[PDB]
Structures are given as C-alpha cells and as structure tokens.
Amino acid sequence: NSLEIEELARFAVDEHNKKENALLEFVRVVKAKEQHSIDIWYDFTMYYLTLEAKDGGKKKLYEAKVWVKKLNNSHTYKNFKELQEFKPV
Amino acid sequence: TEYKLVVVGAGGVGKSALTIQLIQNHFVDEYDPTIEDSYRKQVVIDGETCLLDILDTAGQEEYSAMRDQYMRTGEGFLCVFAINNTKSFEDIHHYREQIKRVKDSEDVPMVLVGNKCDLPSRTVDTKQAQDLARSYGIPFIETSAKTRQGVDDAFYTLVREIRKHK
Ligand SMILES: Nc1nc2c(ncn2[C@@H]2O[C@H](COP(=O)(O)OP(=O)(O)O)[C@@H](O)[C@H]2O)c(=O)[nH]1
Ligand SMILES: [Mg+2]
C-alpha cells in the first residue's frame, strides 16, 4: 500500500552493508507489512519487509524491520528512518 | 464506568497543571515537562459516579507506547492552547488533524481549551478561539490551572461530549 516500499528496502540493504561491511545487491520486495502509529504530532511506522538480495552472486531472502518517523505539518528535517532488524531466511 | 481522556497541546500550555488541578485539586507551578503518565480520579458528573482515566501527554518528538495505547483507546481529547501564546493556538489544527486521523473520524469527542485566563493580559483573542471551535463543531472553554477557573467544566464538558457520541 505504501509508495516507498522498494525505497525503504534499498535503505535496509544499504544500512546492512554499511554496518556489516557487506555488499548485498537489492533485487526486489516479495512481502511488505506496515504497523502505522498516528501520534499527537508525528506519524511512526514499523515496516516489515521480506526482500530478495544477492550475496556475492547467490539470491537470498532477508526479513527487515524499518522504523520511520514522518511529519504531516512540515516537510522533512524532523523525519527519520532506522533499520532495526535484518536477518536472512 | 470509565471515561478515557487524553490531554494534548504544545509544551508549556498547562496540560500537567490542568490535570493535577482536577486530580489533586491544587496548582503545581513547576512540573517536569518531560513526564507523561496517566492518572485516575473517581468523580460525580450529572449524578453519575464514574472514573476518569486521563493521559497527560508530554514529549511529542519521541514515540510513546503509552500515548499509542491512549490514542487508540481514548474516548475524548482536550486540545489545550495558552491564551498568551499564539503559537500554541496555531498548533491546535495539527493536533485535531492527528486525532481525527487516528480515529479515522471527523466526529471525535473533543473540547478546545484556552488555558491561563487568570493572566490580566492575553494575545489570542477569545472570539478567534470561539470562531475556530464553532468551525470544528466542538465546545470552547477558558480555564486557569492557577485559579481552578473552568477546569471542572473543561473535563466534564468532555465527558458530556463522550456521552453524546455513545
Ligand atoms: N498563570 C498561569 N500559569 C500556568 C497555568 N497553567 C500552567 N501554568 C504555568 O505554565 C508553565 C507550564 O505548565 P505545564 O502544566 O508544565 O505545561 P505542559 O508542558 O503543557 O504540561 C508552568 O510554569 C506552570 O506553572 C495557568 O492556568 N495560569
Ligand atoms: Mg506537562
């Protein structure tokens, strides 16, 4: 339903690679789920993504959790994006 | 019988002062602005013995599992501004938006509160607040956490609003 699923997935792969000194190549998202929290000011969303990535050639699945703080009264700046979990399956 | 209420508004409008005046019946000058917590008080409203469960919100910049629960299960909302701070009055529109959004509903029990009406001066015109409240289709009540002015009326009006929508 989100129009930033593929983007958040790439962010996940990137952030994993960054943190874990890896070089996974993002292929695509196979499953996505949302946990949307409308708060008094910001919106917070936990994204649960199952993505395909290539690990020095071979295609593997990874489940990623991405945490997103986003505002609907002023663009960016106090927005935020964070990989919480990223594990092979 | 419980009424779950949520008190919202920019920091420094007197959310805590209002809440503590209704619960403990005294004015607290300097309440830690970071402290968010729920408080319960049994009261009588229009001959009804009932329990009010009130979340005094604080720290809107960080996610709160507590606030999350009360946004979902809260029955009514006090949107508070300060009558001597225009910014707090402007923030009201976004608070209301987020409450409508979380309930997916225009028709959420809600009372607009103009706090600090004890002060001899004011910056936000009364008629402006009345005009806004009317546009939203909600009650507007002027309060003073310092003098206790309109505090009972603020929370009870909300309970009456919640009663209407049941
Ligand atoms: N004069 C006056 N001061 C108030 C009133 N309510 C709160 N205050 C003061 O305004 C400041 C912020 O109050 P607080 O309840 O902590 O605001 P909150 O951040 O919304 O919880 C404090 O210094 C309070 O003493 C009021 O009705 N009248
Ligand atoms: Mg407070």
Author numbering:
A (entry chain B): 4 to 92
B (entry chain A): 2 to 167
From the article:
The RAS family of small GTPases consists of four members, KRAS4A, KRAS4B, HRAS, and NRAS, which act as bi-directional molecular switches that cycle between an inactive GDP-bound form, and an active GTP-bound form. RAS mutations are the most common oncogenic drivers across human cancers, but there remains a paucity of clinically-validated pharmacological inhibitors of RAS, as druggable pockets have proven difficult to identify. Here, we identify two RAS-binding Affimer proteins, K3 and K6, that inhibit nucleotide exchange and downstream signaling pathways with distinct isoform and mutant profiles. Here, we demonstrate the use of Affimer proteins, a scaffold-based biologic, to identify and directly probe two druggable pockets on wild-type KRAS associated with inhibition of nucleotide exchange and effector molecule binding.
The underlying reasons for this were confirmed by determining the crystal structure of Affimer K3 in complex with the GDP-bound form of KRAS to 2.1 Å resolution, however, crystallization of this complex was difficult leading to lower than anticipated Rfactor and FreeRfactor values (see “Methods” section for details). Affimer K3 binds KRAS with high affinity irrespective of the nucleotide bound (KD = 59.4 ± 15 nM for GDP-bound and KD = 44.4 ± 0.8 nM for GppNHp-bound). Variable region 1 binds KRAS between SII and the α3 helix, with residues 41–46 being crucial for interaction and inhibition. Indeed, the functional importance of these Affimer residues was highlighted by mutational analysis, as individual alanine substitutions abolished the inhibition of SOS1-mediated nucleotide exchange. Affimer K3 residue D42 bridges the gap between SII and α3 helix, forming hydrogen bonds with R68 and Q99, respectively. The involvement of Affimer K3 residue W44 in binding H95 may explain the specificity of K3 for KRAS seen in the biochemical and cellular data, as H95 is a unique residue only present in KRAS and not in HRAS and NRAS. Thus, Affimer K3 has identified a conformer of wild-type KRAS that generates a druggable pocket, with an estimated interface area of 790.6 Å (PISA (EMBL-EBI)31 analysis), buried between the SII region and the α3 helix, not previously observed in wild-type KRAS.
